[PDB]
Symmetry: C2
């Protein structure tokens, strides 16, 4: 349903910080997204909340979820771990045409992987979820959206 | 040395695209950055050039470099592989005080890990390298810099 702007942020430090604030009371976070494109975002935000027990769900396949574990290299994928979560974070790639996932497979994921009473979140770039119609199709509790722009310089 | 602005980009697809362009003639790419916060950027951009032979170097420790390999989950760390590279991409976290790495250590890494005649690149956010004085301290061939801003919304 209707999503109201809470606040703005700037830079990577604040991007991680508003996520930490959003999940402050959570024990177990699940990040669901498209392998390759979205996996790095799951690893980045899991790192920011590495105190929690975190998992990565590929596409909408909860049975293939793996632990997001801290190593000397950062966050890496660990063993299969289809435990439900008290915050489920959908990544923007899921909403992409062609395999993002269909809305009914997404709703089944929410039914299966999010514990009853848990929070549904989205983390995306360039307003992907709003643009896909997903604010009307899903009941997000919180969405964090970032925009990216930049420059290439040569020596 | 002096870095001249070449072009601007917007969004994730274009961010990946300018990187693909910058390394189009490369065969093996090394990404060096701080584990945890920078590893995901190495994985993201490696995915974007998954046709190449790519490695992740933790901090400035070449001997601990690992292959960046594509799996059904995205890019994951594989075996130790301290082979030099024809493009070395320093990640912005390396320039952060406190372990970002000392500049002598970074110069050593460029000498050990970058092939003679290879290209030295920077990939950072929020203009980290310029702000740390690294355009004066290092001779980058290309730097790709992105800024992030966004919003939090609630349901």
């Amino acid at each position: 349903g209707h999503m109201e702007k809470l606040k703005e942020f700037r830079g990577i430090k604040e991007h991680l910080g508003v996520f930490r604030e959003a999940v402050k009371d959570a024990e177990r976070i699940g990040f669901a997204g498209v392998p390759g494109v979205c996996t790095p975002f799951a690893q980045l935000f899991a790192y920011a909340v590495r105190d929690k027990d975190n998992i990565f769900i590929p596409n909408t396949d909860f049975s293939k979820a793996r632990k997001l574990e801290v190593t000397e290299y950062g966050v890496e994928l660990g063993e299969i771990s289809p435990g439900n979560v008290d915050v489920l974070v959908l990544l923007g790639g899921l909403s992409m045409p062609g395999i993002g996932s269909d809305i009914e497979d997404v709703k089944k994921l929410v039914e299966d992987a999010l514990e009853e009473g848990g929070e549904l979140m989205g983390l995306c770039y360039m307003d992907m979820f709003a643009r896909a119609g997903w604010y009307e199709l899903l009941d997000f509790d919180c969405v964090i959206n970032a925009d990216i722009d930049g420059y290439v310089l040569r020596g």
